[PDB]
Enzyme design. Structure first.
Site, PDB file in Angstrom:
ATOM      1  N   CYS A  41       0.807  -1.219   0.000  1.00  0.00           N
ATOM      2  CA  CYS A  41       0.000   0.000   0.000  1.00  0.00           C
ATOM      3  C   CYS A  41       0.843   1.272   0.000  1.00  0.00           C
ATOM      4  CB  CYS A  41      -0.887   0.031   1.249  1.00  0.00           C
ATOM      5  SG  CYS A  41      -1.875   1.532   1.355  1.00  0.00           S
ATOM      6  N   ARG A  78      -0.049   4.592   2.900  1.00  0.00           N
ATOM      7  CA  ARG A  78       0.102   4.356   4.343  1.00  0.00           C
ATOM      8  C   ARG A  78       0.465   5.541   5.233  1.00  0.00           C
ATOM      9  NH1 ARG A  78       4.114  -0.482   4.819  1.00  0.00           N
ATOM     10  NH2 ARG A  78       4.593  -0.111   2.590  1.00  0.00           N
ATOM     11  N   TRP A  88      -9.362   6.409  -0.377  1.00  0.00           N
ATOM     12  CA  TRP A  88      -9.785   7.028  -1.615  1.00  0.00           C
ATOM     13  C   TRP A  88      -8.902   6.470  -2.724  1.00  0.00           C
ATOM     14  CZ3 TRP A  88      -8.123  10.108   2.541  1.00  0.00           C
ATOM     15  CH2 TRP A  88      -6.764  10.432   2.522  1.00  0.00           C
ATOM     16  N   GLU A 125      -5.321   3.559 -10.545  1.00  0.00           N
ATOM     17  CA  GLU A 125      -6.040   2.288 -10.314  1.00  0.00           C
ATOM     18  C   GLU A 125      -7.202   2.179 -11.271  1.00  0.00           C
ATOM     19  OE1 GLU A 125      -6.493   1.047  -5.930  1.00  0.00           O
ATOM     20  OE2 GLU A 125      -6.225   3.236  -5.787  1.00  0.00           O
TER      21      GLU A 125
HETATM   22  C1  HEM Z   1      -6.352   6.569   2.013  1.00  0.00           C
HETATM   23  C2  HEM Z   1      -6.180   6.263   0.703  1.00  0.00           C
HETATM   24  C3  HEM Z   1      -5.476   5.059   0.173  1.00  0.00           C
HETATM   25  C4  HEM Z   1      -4.802   4.991  -1.009  1.00  0.00           C
HETATM   26  C5  HEM Z   1      -4.653   6.128  -1.999  1.00  0.00           C
HETATM   27  C6  HEM Z   1      -4.289   3.677  -1.141  1.00  0.00           C
HETATM   28  C7  HEM Z   1      -3.584   3.244  -2.270  1.00  0.00           C
HETATM   29  C8  HEM Z   1      -3.410   1.887  -2.542  1.00  0.00           C
HETATM   30  C9  HEM Z   1      -3.104   1.339  -3.829  1.00  0.00           C
HETATM   31  C10 HEM Z   1      -2.972   2.143  -5.107  1.00  0.00           C
HETATM   32  C11 HEM Z   1      -2.978  -0.020  -3.695  1.00  0.00           C
HETATM   33  C12 HEM Z   1      -2.685  -1.037  -4.779  1.00  0.00           C
HETATM   34  C13 HEM Z   1      -4.012  -1.641  -5.257  1.00  0.00           C
HETATM   35  C14 HEM Z   1      -3.974  -2.446  -6.533  1.00  0.00           C
HETATM   36  O1  HEM Z   1      -3.079  -2.266  -7.420  1.00  0.00           O
HETATM   37  O2  HEM Z   1      -4.865  -3.331  -6.672  1.00  0.00           O
HETATM   38  C15 HEM Z   1      -3.204  -0.310  -2.319  1.00  0.00           C
HETATM   39  C16 HEM Z   1      -3.083  -1.570  -1.805  1.00  0.00           C
HETATM   40  C17 HEM Z   1      -3.493  -1.840  -0.508  1.00  0.00           C
HETATM   41  N1  HEM Z   1      -3.966  -0.969   0.420  1.00  0.00           N
HETATM   42 FE1  HEM Z   1      -4.063   0.934   0.305  1.00  0.00          FE
HETATM   43  N2  HEM Z   1      -4.626   2.932  -0.081  1.00  0.00           N
HETATM   44  C18 HEM Z   1      -5.328   3.705   0.780  1.00  0.00           C
HETATM   45  C19 HEM Z   1      -5.944   3.336   1.982  1.00  0.00           C
HETATM   46  C20 HEM Z   1      -5.925   2.055   2.539  1.00  0.00           C
HETATM   47  C21 HEM Z   1      -6.571   1.657   3.736  1.00  0.00           C
HETATM   48  C22 HEM Z   1      -7.446   2.571   4.576  1.00  0.00           C
HETATM   49  C23 HEM Z   1      -6.229   0.327   3.979  1.00  0.00           C
HETATM   50  C24 HEM Z   1      -6.627  -0.549   5.105  1.00  0.00           C
HETATM   51  C25 HEM Z   1      -6.981  -0.081   6.327  1.00  0.00           C
HETATM   52  C26 HEM Z   1      -5.381  -0.085   2.875  1.00  0.00           C
HETATM   53  C27 HEM Z   1      -4.804  -1.324   2.742  1.00  0.00           C
HETATM   54  C28 HEM Z   1      -4.237  -1.717   1.512  1.00  0.00           C
HETATM   55  C29 HEM Z   1      -3.939  -3.124   1.267  1.00  0.00           C
HETATM   56  C30 HEM Z   1      -4.142  -4.292   2.203  1.00  0.00           C
HETATM   57  C31 HEM Z   1      -3.484  -3.216  -0.004  1.00  0.00           C
HETATM   58  C32 HEM Z   1      -3.031  -4.487  -0.705  1.00  0.00           C
HETATM   59  C33 HEM Z   1      -4.192  -5.316  -1.311  1.00  0.00           C
HETATM   60  C34 HEM Z   1      -3.760  -6.588  -2.021  1.00  0.00           C
HETATM   61  O3  HEM Z   1      -2.708  -7.214  -1.755  1.00  0.00           O
HETATM   62  O4  HEM Z   1      -4.507  -7.077  -2.889  1.00  0.00           O
HETATM   63  N3  HEM Z   1      -5.204   1.005   2.060  1.00  0.00           N
HETATM   64  N4  HEM Z   1      -3.448   0.860  -1.619  1.00  0.00           N
HETATM   65  N1  LIG Z   2      -7.172   3.363  -3.295  1.00  0.00           N
HETATM   66  C1  LIG Z   2      -7.172   2.188  -2.613  1.00  0.00           C
HETATM   67  C2  LIG Z   2      -7.342   2.165  -1.225  1.00  0.00           C
HETATM   68  C3  LIG Z   2      -7.311   0.940  -0.562  1.00  0.00           C
HETATM   69  C4  LIG Z   2      -7.132  -0.221  -1.296  1.00  0.00           C
HETATM   70  C5  LIG Z   2      -7.106  -1.450  -0.665  1.00  0.00           C
HETATM   71  C6  LIG Z   2      -6.933  -2.604  -1.410  1.00  0.00           C
HETATM   72  C7  LIG Z   2      -6.800  -2.545  -2.769  1.00  0.00           C
HETATM   73  C8  LIG Z   2      -6.588  -3.817  -3.547  1.00  0.00           C
HETATM   74  C9  LIG Z   2      -7.666  -4.001  -4.590  1.00  0.00           C
HETATM   75  N2  LIG Z   2      -7.222  -4.885  -5.685  1.00  0.00           N
HETATM   76  C10 LIG Z   2      -6.769  -6.205  -5.218  1.00  0.00           C
HETATM   77  C11 LIG Z   2      -6.345  -7.051  -6.426  1.00  0.00           C
HETATM   78  C12 LIG Z   2      -7.565  -7.457  -7.241  1.00  0.00           C
HETATM   79  C13 LIG Z   2      -8.521  -8.301  -6.692  1.00  0.00           C
HETATM   80  C14 LIG Z   2      -9.655  -8.666  -7.420  1.00  0.00           C
HETATM   81  C15 LIG Z   2      -9.841  -8.191  -8.711  1.00  0.00           C
HETATM   82  C16 LIG Z   2      -8.884  -7.352  -9.255  1.00  0.00           C
HETATM   83  F1  LIG Z   2      -9.056  -6.897 -10.502  1.00  0.00           F
HETATM   84  C17 LIG Z   2      -7.749  -6.982  -8.529  1.00  0.00           C
HETATM   85  C18 LIG Z   2      -6.835  -1.309  -3.405  1.00  0.00           C
HETATM   86  C19 LIG Z   2      -6.995  -0.159  -2.672  1.00  0.00           C
HETATM   87  N3  LIG Z   2      -7.016   1.036  -3.297  1.00  0.00           N
HETATM   88 CL   LIG Z   3     -10.418  -1.043  -7.886  1.00  0.00          CL
END
Ligand code: HEM
Ligand SMILES: Nc1ccc2ccc(CCNCCc3cccc(F)c3)cc2n1
Ligand SMILES: [Cl-]
Ligand code: HEM
Ligand SMILES: Nc1ccc2ccc(CCNCCc3cccc(F)c3)cc2n1
Ligand SMILES: C[C@H](O)[C@H](O)[C@H]1CNc2nc(N)[nH]c(=O)c2N1
Ligand SMILES: C[C@H](O)[C@H](O)[C@H]1CNc2nc(N)[nH]c(=O)c2N1
Ligand SMILES: [Cl-]
Lengths: 362, 362
Positions: A65, A68, A237, A242
């Site tokens: 993420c 963070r 957000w 994405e």
């Molecule tokens: C506040 C705005 C936030 C932004 C802009 C952000 C941004 C991102 C982005 C761009 C990804 C990659 C997603 C992808 O390519 O599918 C991501 C992954 C992730 N984010 Fe964040 N995030 C935010 C908030 C959060 C919050 C609030 C949580 C949990 C409390 C979180 C937990 C994660 C986790 C667990 C992943 C990895 C998911 C996976 O392995 O499939 N994020 N985040």
């Molecule tokens: N902007 C954010 C904020 C929090 C997030 C938390 C988690 C994620 C991961 C979402 N994508 C997981 C990978 C996936 C799973 C299932 C279908 C897909 F096309 C891709 C994206 C986030 N984006």
């Molecule tokens: Cl999405």
């Protein structure tokens, strides 16, 4: 034997959590209470303070993420009290409303009762609470291909989609004791969507693209001190890429780059023209413009990476090890224009954290 | 004890090489000869066939290289006969000429005598045979910052650069027995350069950008069957992003994106305008256009990735394991538009291969 794993995870989490909260002297007594509780019940119940800080630590430790920096301001909603499907439904509706916040998105997590004997109390089927359906039959592709299997499972349960490219899937979850999940159509008044337009190319609206305002990931397990919260949806957000570089661009998703190239008036004939790259940039500019124009929160990848640099700096100052997954942190457009691309990250897994879990359908 | 490591590497390389060449029955006799030779001399000498196939295998095994489809057509020049600095110089001049081939670039390697007791016979100081100098003093930055330390070492040796942004560094190498390297100015007739212009933005030429035609990497060690060829420069043709997204774009290189944004007529004020991304795309289109217009070989990242997909397919069909470094294979612009981004690669090191070695200056 499982009381063993639980107790160990508990000791480690409580010590760390309480140090961070300035409550280090309360650890001995709390662990004593926890220890009796495990012996007698097989589990233990987090205080509201532990649960809140645990969810925040889990975000802080999410290697993939980029967002963070803001881990400590996560809005934690404790719904460990729910017992009925109507309460679960209304908790999910409330999460959408409060997270959305009229466009000024609040990063929020709603935490449902945790697994007991590895027995789920509540099992959410949605990948995100708001997500579009996908269909494919007779070569005909409609909507979001990543939603095809859940869409088919929903239609096994008596739901039917209108087969637009943007059908909202119903909420779908199963309660302990029930053989089948139930489903509830989302009230449209709760769901903000953003039509995609371009700041200076008027024809871009001919594509009739839109996306939903808030990504609320609902299929991951939150683990905190040995307790497994399998149902704990959370949201931030969006980062623009994405939506613009993946959801709307991937060949196995909405696959819009050729149509984008056409409306922006460039040929899509020669790799050396870099038309895919140019189309990606204009699609991503359009997404950011559109969210901003509608007053829905969004961040661009450059600003996001500069926030993440501050998170790295904060971790060092706090004396915490930083972990990260370089392959997910780099954005899918202009990654080498961010500092992330030019350094390396330790991909070790630290708990509390969010984890994948097996899908209940398919 | 070192005869041990050498012999083991030899057995493994000769067996593999000869299998691939259909010469499997000759392995026993050849290894017997090799074994006596090691016993008596401490080393062994590759046949011309072994050396050629070894260099080709080393390219095939280069995890970070997207251009590997063409591994088997590498042009191998055997210069193990050189003994004087004039011969080394002329071999290097010849490599530039034959690799360049009037613009129709031939992937080529020139192989110099290998290390003996870990004693280098020839030690090349250049990173690439053709590369621009870099200077920095009193806050003033000129040329290519990545060349600053070699530039300073060259000026210790009596060379002086004109301090343009594009001074060609001299060839610089040291012979066994000499305390200091010698240097030779490159004949300008041998060096093709390409002025960077844009297919439809006439003002782009105001930036007065150029780059050289052929990247000839001259500081890596080729290892083949236990023999260490520390001096063995090789070249391909450029992939456009190397020049447009890195050499000309990185803040720690020529840092041209703000100037690019200005000449293409966009503001460089707001991250949400994605002006860096747009500038990167136009700079990369310009680089490809310019090389093509001048008749110098170049490949765009999309075509390169589709060639690499064929390399993956070829490896499977040949029954060979594929190795790769995902973090280097993805291109620095629109990586998610390539298939590379969406799969994973085993980053194991297989020999023969090319390796980093310590710089002799700094
Ligand atoms: C506040 C705005 C936030 C932004 C802009 C952000 C941004 C991102 C982005 C761009 C990804 C990659 C997603 C992808 O390519 O599918 C991501 C992954 C992730 N984010 Fe964040 N995030 C935010 C908030 C959060 C919050 C609030 C949580 C949990 C409390 C979180 C937990 C994660 C986790 C667990 C992943 C990895 C998911 C996976 O392995 O499939 N994020 N985040
Ligand atoms: N902007 C954010 C904020 C929090 C997030 C938390 C988690 C994620 C991961 C979402 N994508 C997981 C990978 C996936 C799973 C299932 C279908 C897909 F096309 C891709 C994206 C986030 N984006
Ligand atoms: Cl999405
Ligand atoms: C024929 C055209 C070729 C193309 C288009 C090509 C493309 C590339 C690219 C883009 C890189 C990454 C460079 C960087 O980011 O710094 C690379 C790395 C590499 N290529 Fe190739 N290549 C080609 C030919 C060759 C040849 C002929 C060899 C050797 C015989 C070679 C060996 C390597 C090696 C060793 C690396 C990694 C260097 C390092 O780790 O620093 N390539 N290639
Ligand atoms: N197009 C090609 C062909 C062959 C190549 C073979 C090797 C390389 C690697 C060159 N860059 C190595 C990393 C490096 C080293 C020194 C200074 C830098 F800025 C970057 C690039 C190639 N590009
Ligand atoms: C195979 C590859 O490592 C993998 O599919 C990843 C690459 N990096 C990524 N990074 C992000 N943020 N999101 C993704 O879906 C992916 N896909
Ligand atoms: C830190 C990071 O892993 C590293 O600096 C890499 C990333 N991937 C790369 N990939 C290529 N092709 N070239 C590079 O110089 C780099 N830099
Ligand atoms: Cl280069």
């Amino acid at each position: 034997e499982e009381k063993e794993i639980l107790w160990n995870e508990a000791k480690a989490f409580i010590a760390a959590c309480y140090q961070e909260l300035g409550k280090a002297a309360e650890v001995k007594d709390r662990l004593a209470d926890i220890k009796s509780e495990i012996d007698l019940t097989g589990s233990y119940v987090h205080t509201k303070e532990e649960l809140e800080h645990g969810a925040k630590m889990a975000w802080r430790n999410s290697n993939r993420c980029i967002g963070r920096l803001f881990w400590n301001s996560l809005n934690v909603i404790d719904r460990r009290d729910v017992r009925t499907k109507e309460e679960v439904r209304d908790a999910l509706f409330h999460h959408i409303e409060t997270a959305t916040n009229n466009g000024k998105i609040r990063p929020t997590i709603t935490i449902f009762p945790p697994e007991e004997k590895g027995e789920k109390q509540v099992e959410i089927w949605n990948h995100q609470l708001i997500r579009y359906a996908g269909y494919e039959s007779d070569g005909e592709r409609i909507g979001d291909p990543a939603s095809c299997s859940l869409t088919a499972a929903c239609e096994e349960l008596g739901w039917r989609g209108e087969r637009t490219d943007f059908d909202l899937l119903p909420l779908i979850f199963r309660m302990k004791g029930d053989e089948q999940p139930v489903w509830y159509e989302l009230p449209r008044s709760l769901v903000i969507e953003v039509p995609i337009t371009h700041p200076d190319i008027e024809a871009f609206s001919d594509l009739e693209l839109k996306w939903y305002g808030v990504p609320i990931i609902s299929d991951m397990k939150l683990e905190v001190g040995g307790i497994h919260y399998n149902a704990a949806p959370f949201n931030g957000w969006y980062m623009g890429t994405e939506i613009g570089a993946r959801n709307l661009a991937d060949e196995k998703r909405y696959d819009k780059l050729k149509k984008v190239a056409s409306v922006i008036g460039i040929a899509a004939d020669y790799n050396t023209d870099l038309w895919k790259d140019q189309a990606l940039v204009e699609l991503n500019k359009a997404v950011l413009h559109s969210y901003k124009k509608q007053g829905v929160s969004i961040v661009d990848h450059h600003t996001a990476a500069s926030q993440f640099k501050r998170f790295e700096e904060q971790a060092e100052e706090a004396g915490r090890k930083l972990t990260g997954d370089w392959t997910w942190l780099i954005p899918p457009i202009s990654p080498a224009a961010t500092h992330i691309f030019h350094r390396s990250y330790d991909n070790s897994i630290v708990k509390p954290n969010y984890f994948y879990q097996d899908k209940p359908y398919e």
